[PDB]
Structure formats: structure tokens, C-alpha cells
Amino acid sequence: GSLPEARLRRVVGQLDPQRLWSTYLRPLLVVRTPGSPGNLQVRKFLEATLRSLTAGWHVELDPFTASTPLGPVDFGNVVATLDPRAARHLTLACHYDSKLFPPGSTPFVGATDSAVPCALLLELAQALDLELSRAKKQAAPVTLQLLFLDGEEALKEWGPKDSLYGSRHLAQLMESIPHSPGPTRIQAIELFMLLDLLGAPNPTFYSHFPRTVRWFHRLRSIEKRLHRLNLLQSHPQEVMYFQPGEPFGSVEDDHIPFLRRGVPVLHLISTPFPAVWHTPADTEVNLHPPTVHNLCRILAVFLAEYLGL
Ligand SMILES: COc1ccc(NC(=S)NCCCn2ccnc2)cc1OC
Numbered sequence: 305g306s307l308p309e310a311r312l313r314r315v316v317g318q319l320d321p322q323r324l325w326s327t328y329l330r331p332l333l334v335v336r337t338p339g340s341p342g343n344l345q346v347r348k349f350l351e352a353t354l355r356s357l358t359a360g361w362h363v364e365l366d367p368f369t370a371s372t373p374l375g376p377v378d379f380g381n382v383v384a385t386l387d388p389r390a391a392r393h394l395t396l397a398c399h400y401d402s403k404l405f406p407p408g409s410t411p412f413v414g415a416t417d418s419a420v421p422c423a424l425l426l427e428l429a430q431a432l433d434l435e436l437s438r439a440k441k442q443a444a445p446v447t448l449q450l451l452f453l454d455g456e457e458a459l460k461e462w463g464p465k466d467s468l469y470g471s472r473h474l475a476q477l478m479e480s481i482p483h484s485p486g487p488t489r490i491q492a493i494e495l496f497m498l499l500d501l502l503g504a505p506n507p508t509f510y511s512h513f514p515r516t517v518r519w520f521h522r523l524r525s526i527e528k529r530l531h532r533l534n535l536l537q538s539h540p541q542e543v544m545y546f547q548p549g550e551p552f553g554s555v556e557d558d559h560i561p562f563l564r565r566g567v568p569v570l571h572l573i574s575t576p577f578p579a580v581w582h583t584p585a586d587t588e589v590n591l592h593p594p595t596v597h598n599l600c601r602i603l604a605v606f607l608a609e610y611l612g613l
């Protein structure tokens with residue numbers, strides 16, 4: 305089910321690039337390492353923004369303390385589920401923490417990693433609010449869930465035990481909570497789409513999981529179409545972002561604890577990584593706004609086709 309063209313143009317017209325940039329992105333671009341005041345302030349900002357949406361999302365924190373290389377630290381995942389009555393949901397996810405670096409440099413704000421992914425989820429929820437509201441009122445069978453995960457990044461060196469604090473905790477939590485039909489909230493996740501490392505110029509994505517390749521092909525088909533319809537900028541070839549063929553390698557990320565429990569995953573991560581990755585230069589001024597908005601348009605069409613909005 306692809307959107308009719310006139311309806312596609314209306315959905316793209318519901319996006320507001322200034323809102324995405326100023327209302328959703330800019331407030332995130334602060335140091336927000338786990339346990340920090342700035343991380344708490346970004347967590348509160350995400351929650352209050354999500355609760356304001358007219359669709360009436362269920363918004364809850366998953367708070368926990370875990371041992372880290374810095375000692376005990378408190379983490380909190382933000383979990384927004386549009387209709388908690390629904391059997392299942394499309395889940396879109398990203399991490400809202402920023403990686404800790406030691407004092408004495410320009411502060412690391414992780415603009416691509418992952419402030420842009422967070423702002424994209426907020427803008428999609430806002431831009432499709434009316435249709436999401438009306439689909440919930442119709443008791444649609446598949447709802448939408450947005451996860452803003454804390455503690456993706458290593459606190460002092462990446463490995464199985466110093467990374468993915470929020471996603472490890474949340475997948476285990478969901479496994480422990482019954483859901484109908486379920487039998488647990490893990491089985492309610494129909495597709496887990498993880499956005500990471502977005503906003504740099506010239507991203508390239510590959511399909512990381514054969515099991516979900518049909519959704520990857522759908523994103524490619526949407527890129528192609530929007531290009532044809534003169535709705536992408538700085539996009540001189542038909543297919544630039546969604547590359548065919550095998551990936552250059554897999555990337556450990558917040559999907560792992562869900563993948564291991566049998567959840568279907570699509571990993572929407574640029575590979576190669578942004579040039580600025582894990583340097584202090586991963587900032588607003590180094591983002592490529594036309595690429596951010598192109599990605600937002602592709603995702604908005606994807607979301608509207610996936611949920612029948
Ligand atoms: C510089 O290019 C790379 C460096 C390392 C890896 N390998 C892994 S397993 N990375 C895990 C990344 C986790 N993450 C996501 C966001 N911030 C951190 C791959 C890279 O290019 C494909």
C-alpha cells in the first residue's frame with residue numbers, strides 16, 4: 305500500500321522543518337551524559353513534549369541504577385506508547401544520552417549521535433498527530449511506540465558490559481511484563497527500527513537483517529519516489545541513501561538486546577559513520593540540514609504507509 309501522490313504531498317506538507325530544528329533539535333544539543341543534570345533536563349523535555357501531543361500517548365519512564373566504571377549511575381529510558389490497548393506496535397528507537405568525554409576539550413553534544421534521531425521521532429509524532437489520534441480512536445490493531453534510550457554509550461570503553469545500559473535494561477523489563485496476546489511486551493514489538501548516526505551529509509544505509517529486508521526495500525522505494533517527485537534536496541541521483549547489497553559489517557547498538565530476544569530489527573544507521581563521529585565536531589554546524597529534512601520526509605512516508613495513516 306503506497307500513498308496516492310496527492311496524499312503523499314499532503315503528508316510531506318505536514319512536516320515543519322523549523323519546528324524540527326528549533327523546537328525539537330536545538331534544545332537537545334547539550335551535554336547529556338548519564339546521571340548529569342543535562343541528561344535529566346533532556347529526559348524531562350522529551351517526556352513533557354510527548355505528553356503534550358493531542359493523540360494522548362502513554363508516556364512512562366524506566367528508571368534504574370546500574371554499576372558502571374564511574375560507580376553507580378542512574379539511567380532512565382523514556383517509553384512512549386500511543387495506544388497501550390493495542391496488541392502490537394511499530395517501535396522506533398534512538399538513544400538520548402551523549403557519550404562522556406573527560407574535561408578539557410570542547411564539550412561533546414553528539415548532534416548526529418543521536419540528537420538528530422531524537423528530533424526526527426518528535427517531529428514525526430507531531431506532524432502525524434492528527435492521523436495518529438484518529439487511528440487510536442478507531443482502536444487500530446498496530447500502534448506506534450517511541451523509545452528514547454539512556455546510556456547507549458560506553459562510560460569509559462565500549463564492550464558487552466560498558467554500553468547499552470538502557471536498552472539491556474528495557475528489553476529485560478519488557479520480557480518480564482505480560483501483554484495480550486503477547487505473552488510478554490517483547491512480542492508486542494512487530495518491528496524495531498533503530499535510528500542512529502543521522503544528520504551528516506551523504507549517509508549510506510545497508511540492510512543489516514535479511515529478516516526485515518522488505519522494509520529496507522520500502523525505504524529505498526520511498527527515496528526513489530520522493531527524488532522523482534522533486535521533493536528531495538541535494539539529491540542528484542535516484543538512489544543515494546539506501547544502498548543495495550551487503551553491509552560492510554554489523555554495528556553493536558541498542559537493538560542487540562531486542563534482537564537476541566527474537567524481535568525483528570531494522571538498523572537505520574549510516575555506515576560509514578559520519579566523519580565527525582565521537583569527536584567534539586559532531587555539532588549543529590556540521591549537520592547537513594537538507595539531508596536531515598530528506599530523511600524526515602522518507603520516514604514520514606514510511607510511517608504513514610506502515611500504519612495506514
Ligand atoms: C568509525 O567507524 C566504526 C567504528 C566502530 C565500529 N564498530 C562498532 S561495533 N561500533 C559500535 C558503535 C556504537 N555506537 C553507535 C553510536 N555511537 C556508538 C564500526 C565503525 O564503522 C562501521
Ligand SMILES: [Zn+2]
Binds near residue numbers: 403417457582
Ligand atoms: Zn556514539
